[PDB]
Design a protein around this ligand. Structure first.
Ligand code: 8QJ
Lengths: 440, 436
């Protein structure tokens, strides 16, 4: 005998509501029933002998999860620690960077940055008083990989032309909205060519795609284990190479491990073990999830290849149903993850305060589609979220990009092709309802 | 009706029957009925993730906020939930805009919690010296007037050096040692001197009356998971609406931040993806403590009365004393400190000249050399669990070790007699040099 087959037969191993269809695993993730049992096993041990377990078994269990995730990512264990989530990790980097005294440091970032990380940038500048500022790089999707590379090299060239210093850049592994594989290998590589700190936001990363940490060699990398590695909610892996760990002077929040102003566990690794009393049972389950995905399922590569294959083929099915298309570039490099974006068969029309000149391909593509007006776009956007939840018992996040709604579907090992055919209707049935102005 | 207190109440908890929890104040524990609430919220989250986590989270957060604000007798618009007390005080210190002249000073007492004290050090490092601090040393047993006078002088001395006392962090109940702190007198002085009163009340809710309305602090944090029978990883953050604008960003910064139901309350709903089931259980722990245990007033009345009579029993057994001032105001919480019957040799680099009463209380007592003080401290911690199946934190103060015992509603006098005999035999083996 061997690993379990994928598809709806795998739902027996999970704890989803059978009447609910989880097309949006990429937002909060979920865990199999066995990992939920492990999580409550750590809860039980924590309340049986609180002080003996929380004081001296927390470092032991953390080190077991650190060695389990480090071998998966194929990095030295001394380079990985656990934090609350991707939002927490990104702040740990941005709040710790000592900016140059001359006030020219600039944070380069793309306009598809996760909203929380973007607002973390906005405030870091407010709190740090304008010693640093930010330059947003507008990306146009579907985006060819070389055009993204070109726009980032153009932002550096422009930054220096205004006498400023591109200091740090945040880079997605897989972007949130739209759910798209980002060419982070090239942008990270040029960050070192131009001596720019690479802060890799890879929240949509571990468990879904190969992060290639040893090869890309980033200065910092964040990734949510609870998103695609079946780790309980509230866990991210924080990778820092030893050359740059001295820059993480304080954790978030500051705790006992901080040092103001031999030869065992490093002070960096020690500082992340106790950062305030929390439930660490999700951190403990990381070694269980990696074990379960390997022993019960085929392993990481068999998991990832199925999801990506299902994301392309299934995204293509809902695209052929709706009569639109998938979000993809000419190199086929955007759908290199478990998520896929499909355009909905209508448009919202020009907004006068912010007009959009679409390319010929985009205008040509919309010919014949039904058009609602722009005042009702936000109203229709909220109406589709409730109806999907209330009538259809599902959730589908949608990206509003250039007068098109792009639905983001996320494939997973407990899903199959019939789950997209169902997604085809619901989106098409519901899109037939917005054309009839039902949201009013 | 109300359940009786004592060892019979251990039925309702899920502690190891071989383990004696004398150390509730460190991490707390929850009854089984709150454990099944925690797992219910966890199960609802995994059943329908996006529908439950996006739209049922704010409703459940508001239900716990209404419950925790109703018990604090404060407006619901004043309270939000943060991860822990450490996270709460980091939210205050990391948001305060310090004066441009670089004269602002953070005032604190040397009994501050280590993480909170370390937070001051980093903030000073993070703000590149635009703000500094001043540590007020304290000697325990500390009379309330001496603490107030040490704070008044710190204010007077701060101004005499061209500095401005800007912010003071005040304990409701200190950690090590576990003592009720005269925060009411210190917060009132903070108002008169126009000093931000950042009240660290981690050892607070469920254990002592915080009298927030009377004291009217600028900020207050308190761990529900310590003494409110709330699952681990929960602290209630109180902010009056007059300073809510000072809290610019949560920790970490999330969607609710506004770059330059109120926005302050909304900003704390979604602050990075976490397990919020501990926050959701606050409403249930409060309701369980009301019906099953008989109400909030009855619980903390029993625990401190038990801490007094139990702490005195331990002191009688060891032949030493409880940590208490002449007013009897230190043991006004569910914790008590008892001196152990030995002494540490004088540290030659950091000599501590004892008062006459301190030196007479240590006469005839066995003495450990200071070079062995850390070795004996680690030995007692290992033996207390491996051989006695319990944990007792000890405060090293003025060449003495003070053991901090945490009273609880599931304990009774027989538990503190056990601790006294356990500690007596433990120190007898220390006197024999067993730690070598
Ligand atoms: C064991 N520990 C949680 C790391 C703490 C001990 C401790 C006691 N009480 C608390 S509550 O945050 N922590 C430390 O040693 O710094």
């Amino acid at each position: 005998t061997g690993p379990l087959p994928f598809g709806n037969s795998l739902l027996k191993e999970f704890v989803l509501d059978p009447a609910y269809r989880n097309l949006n695993h990429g937002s909060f993730g979920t865990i199999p029933s066995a990992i939920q049992q492990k999580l409550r096993s750590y809860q039980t041990a924590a309340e049986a002998r609180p002080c003996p377990f929380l004081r001296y078994q927390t470092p032991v269990l953390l080190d077991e999860s650190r060695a389990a995730v480090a071998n998966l990512l194929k990095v030295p264990v001394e380079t990985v620690v656990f934090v609350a989530n991707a939002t927490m990790g990104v702040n740990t980097v941005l709040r710790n960077i000592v900016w140059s005294a001359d006030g020219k440091d600039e944070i380069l970032y793309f306009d598809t940055i996760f909203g929380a990380c973007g607002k973390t940038i906005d405030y870091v500048i407010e709190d740090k008083r304008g010693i640093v500022s930010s330059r947003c790089i507008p990306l146009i999707y579907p985006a060819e990989d070389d055009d993204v590379v070109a726009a980032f090299r153009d932002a550096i060239k422009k930054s220096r032309e205004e006498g400023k210093r591109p200091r740090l850049a945040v880079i997605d592994v897989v972007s949130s909205m739209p759910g798209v594989r980002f060419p982070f290998e090239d942008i990270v590589k040029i960050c070192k060519e131009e001596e720019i700190i690479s802060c890799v936001d890879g929240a949509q990363g571990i468990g879904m795609v190969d992060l290639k940490i040893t090869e890309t060699d980033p200065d910092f990398l964040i990734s949510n284990c609870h998103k695609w590695l079946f780790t309980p909610r509230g866990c991210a892996v924080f990778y820092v190479p030893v050359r740059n760990q001295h820059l993480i002077r304080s954790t978030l929040p500051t705790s006992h491990g901080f040092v103001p102003q031999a030869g065992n566990k490093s002070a960096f690794v020690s500082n992340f073990e106790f950062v305030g009393t929390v439930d660490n049972s999700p951190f403990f389950c990381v070694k269980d999830a990696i074990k379960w995905r390997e022993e019960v399922l085929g392993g990481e590569e068999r998991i990832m290849e199925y999801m990506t294959k299902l994301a392309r083929e299934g995204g293509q099915k809902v695209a052929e149903i709706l009569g639109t298309r998938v979000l993809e570039n000419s190199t086929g490099t955007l759908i290199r993850c478990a998520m896929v974006n499909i355009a909905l068969p209508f448009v919202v029309g020009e907004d006068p305060k912010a007009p959009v000149k679409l390319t010929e391909k985009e205008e040509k593509d919309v010919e014949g589609l039904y058009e609602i007006p722009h005042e009702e776009a936000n109203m229709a956007f909220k109406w589709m979220y409730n109806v999907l939840q209330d009538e259809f018992n599902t959730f589908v996040p949608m990206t509003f990009h250039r007068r098109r709604f792009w639905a983001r579907l996320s494939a997973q090992v407990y899903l199959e092709m019939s789950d997209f055919e169902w997604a085809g209707k619901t989106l098409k049935e519901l899109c037939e309802r917005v054309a009839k102005g039902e949201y009013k």
